[PDB]
Amino acid sequence: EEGLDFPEYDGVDRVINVNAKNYKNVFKKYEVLALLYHEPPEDDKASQRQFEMEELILELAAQVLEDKGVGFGLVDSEKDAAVAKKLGLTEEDSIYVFKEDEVIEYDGEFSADTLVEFLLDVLEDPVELIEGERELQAFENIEDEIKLIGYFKNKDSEHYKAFKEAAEEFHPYIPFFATFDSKVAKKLTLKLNEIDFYEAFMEEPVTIPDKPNSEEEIVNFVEEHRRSTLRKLKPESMYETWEDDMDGIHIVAFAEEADPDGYEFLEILKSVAQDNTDNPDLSIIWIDPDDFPLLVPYWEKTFDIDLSAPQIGVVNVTDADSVWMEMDDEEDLPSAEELEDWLEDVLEGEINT
Amino acid sequence: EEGLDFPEYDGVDRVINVNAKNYKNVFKKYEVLALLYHEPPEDDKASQRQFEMEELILELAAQVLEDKGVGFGLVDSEKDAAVAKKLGLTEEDSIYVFKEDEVIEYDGEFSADTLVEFLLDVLEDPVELIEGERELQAFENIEDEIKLIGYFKNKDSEHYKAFKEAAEEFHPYIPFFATFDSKVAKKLTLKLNEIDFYEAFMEEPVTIPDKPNSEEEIVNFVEEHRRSTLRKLKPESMYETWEDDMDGIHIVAFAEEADPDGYEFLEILKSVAQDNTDNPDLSIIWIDPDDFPLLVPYWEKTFDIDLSAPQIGVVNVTDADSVWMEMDDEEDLPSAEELEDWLEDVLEGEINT
Ligand SMILES: [Ca+2]
Ligand SMILES: [Ca+2]
Ligand SMILES: [Ca+2]
Ligand SMILES: [Ca+2]
Ligand SMILES: [Ca+2]
Ligand SMILES: [Ca+2]
Ligand SMILES: [Ca+2]
Ligand SMILES: [Ca+2]
Ligand code: NA
Ligand code: NA
């Protein structure tokens, strides 16, 4: 009578060597397929160990998601070059995710936790329908990502169908919501076929012009407004966000949401964002250190800061050179006006404008 | 001008094969040392893959914590049996952590995130001193773990020294706090040399009897009150918590703190705990599904429940057989009285009392 153990990695291989002979069979077996497009084995042990690690991370995810019908596979850039061509794999050592007719080029953290969460999100339907109070409140409480909501007659509306096609284009990174309920639309202030776009951390939405909107009109609008003035660094999308610099730099704010000072600082950052939302030259990345435990020592060393306290700085993406605002924790945090004044001082001696 | 990359696992081996010839040198090099006491390689590939995974997890942690002077090593139960004896390694395939004169037998999740967070906590001083407002408020806001606070004259008080020795015994699992400030003591209602013990999720503390307290008096008291009526499953300690069953079963509640319904349910659970805090036969484990993304599919399948909603049930630790309370999400959540009545109904047909 020992007592059952928690689940454990079982050491059984599940990741598929995807090749010319089996790739069609593989796609037929799984509704969602995650493929690592990678390079051939190098001579050096370091590279071999790096690959060994990545493959095992995939093995763990494959074990967790086996019952859900998610498949995992490897496409070698040498041995499987022709497979890569048919599927459109190009980015070296990168994960591509396939669902029905959509291909996703994953640009997030290579960890089992993050990958499993992402793939569970991929499995969900692309549009969330709002019918009840719980669901409406859930929609209203989303602030840390862009979100869209439309009001349509019902699921058979050509305009709802266009909205759903657009949703699939950005799935699962940007949540699309719909309602068919005139009462809900009333609370959201939506006319029929109207789509409201909510920038991350903004209270007021922008309505997509020229309704009813075609799928292309929605997709164009979202692409144009893809970068929020304030955006959160999230494991699922961290590389895409960081690679999207503003002329070689990022304004970076560290704030632990769960901490009193972190929360207050975030509220200040949201104010700064709101007051500058129309300036296309401004993007601030909010990093909550609690989301990236393995990077905190690196950040503290590299930036010479204490991540137990809120920070704001400017980072050069070429060499990670940076400058950080002095804040005395014995005083109140700087107001939005003080933050903006500091950013102006620092950025006045920089690249442009 | 590509742009610097985020840090990555470099594939360089850092985990030490600890043996009879080097073990004394290893302990001298590091202030904190984490040793995996493990079995010799089996013949089957499955076992070999399991070990391969564990070792690489240690490699990742070793890379992250290299600058902090944390060392990682392997002690083979066959090749290194004599080393295991000198150090007191006994638990098969288990991690032991060494700091100065303390040995910790890790009983938490074997993941790099969790291990690094734990070891960063190990590195910190065992007693947190409360001098200012921020620190006092931080102390007051802790609810999900047991905490102790004492008021002493200064660091040279023999009674403070006893408190610190006791703190080292439970470090870093149970936070010990001290103040030397009479004003702070006044707000906390502490007399000189008085130590207040706060059970997790309880508002009212219990004062350790018979002050001033010896180190042994404090340690005895903490051990006697080690199990809180409501306790949170945490990655760092999950196996210790789960293995501490109440006569073969656990009452388990799933609640996502960040969700409206989850938060409300947690508030109800806290009420249930408070109303039954004196009953030594009652322990409820609160699991926030958000803390264990890799186990959610397993739990949903095994227990036949939807973890997007609050749940409460009784689980048999032998075979994971279970029963879960029906709650209709279109109605309000059950009151504390309803929850208690349900638990009584289910547990009346069980093992004892
Ligand atoms: Ca292949
Ligand atoms: Ca409107
Ligand atoms: Ca139109
Ligand atoms: Ca904006
Ligand atoms: Ca060894
Ligand atoms: Ca008191
Ligand atoms: Ca005494
Ligand atoms: Ca109690
Ligand atoms: Na999403
Ligand atoms: Na702790």
B242 contacts in chain A (CB < 8 Å) = 6
Quick one: resolution in A? 1.7
A9: contact with B, CB 8 A cutoff: yes
The gap from C-alpha A34 to its chain's centroid, in whole angstroms, comes to 17
Burial pattern A156-194, b for ≥16 Cβ within 10 A else e, equals ebebbebbbbbbbbbbbbbbbbbbbbeebbeebebeebb
Ligand sitting nearest the alpha carbon of A149: 2
Method for this entry: X-ray
Distance from CA of B206 to the nearest CA of A (A): 27
Structure tokens at B179: 């103040």
B3: contact with A, CB 8 A cutoff: yes
Beta strand pairing status for B94-99 and B127-129? unpaired
Strand locations in A202-282, DSSP E? 206-207, 230-232, 249-254
- DSSP H or E run through B131: none
Structure tokens at B111: 């993941």
Closest to B261 (Cα-Cα) out of B306, B304, B218, B292: B306
Angle between helices A45-65 and A112-123 (to 10 degrees): 40
Closest to B151 (Cα-Cα) out of B141, B136, B137: B136
Paired strand residues for A73: A16, A35
Paired strand residues for B254: B287, B311
> In whole angstroms, what is the distance from residue B116 CA to residue B110 CA?
10
Distance from CA of B288 to the nearest CA of A (A): 15
Ligand sitting nearest the alpha carbon of B190: 6
Paired strand residues for B195: B150
Q: What residue ranges define each of the domains in chain A, with the CATH number in brackets? A: 1-126 (3.40.30.10), 127-228 (3.40.30.10), 229-353 (3.40.30.10)
Locate tokens 């442009």: which residue?
A352
> In whole angstroms, what is the distance from residue B50 CA to residue A284 CA?
42
**CB–CB contact A9 B50 (8 Å):** yes
The gap from C-alpha B249 to its chain's centroid, in whole angstroms, comes to 20
Q: How much distance in Å is there from the Cα of B18 to the middle of ligand 5?
A: 4
- Mutation target to probe the B interface, by most B beta carbons within 10 A, among A1, A2, A5, A6 is A6
- DSSP H or E run through A143: none
B56 contacts in chain A (CB < 8 Å) = 49, 52-53, 56
**B193 with B159: CB under 8 angstroms?**
yes
Locate tokens 């995996």: which residue?
B36
B296 contacts in chain A (CB < 8 Å) = 120
**A291 with A235: CB under 8 angstroms?**
yes
Paired strand residues for B313: B252, B324
- DSSP H or E run through B80: none
Closest to B193 (Cα-Cα) out of B144, B243, B154, B248: B154
The neighbour count for residue B228, using CB atoms within 10 Å, is 19
B52: contact with A, CB 8 A cutoff: yes
The gap from C-alpha B91 to its chain's centroid, in whole angstroms, comes to 18
B8: contact with A, CB 8 A cutoff: yes
A258: contact with B, CB 8 A cutoff: no
Nearest chain A residue to B317, by CA: A3
Residue A73 DSSP SS3 = strand
Structure tokens at B94: 């288990």
- Mutation target to probe the A interface, by most A beta carbons within 10 A, among B131, B245, B294 is B294
Q: What strands lie across the sheet with B147-151, from one edge to the other?
A: B127-129, B176-179, B147-151, B195-198, B206-207
Structure tokens at B278: 């004196």
> In whole angstroms, what is the distance from residue A62 CA to residue A65 CA?
5
Let me know how long chain B is.
Answer: 353
Cβ-Cβ pairs closer than 8 A, A with B, add up to 125
Burial pattern B233-271, b for ≥16 Cβ within 10 A else e, equals bbbbbbbebbeebbeebbbbbbbbeebebbeebbebbbb
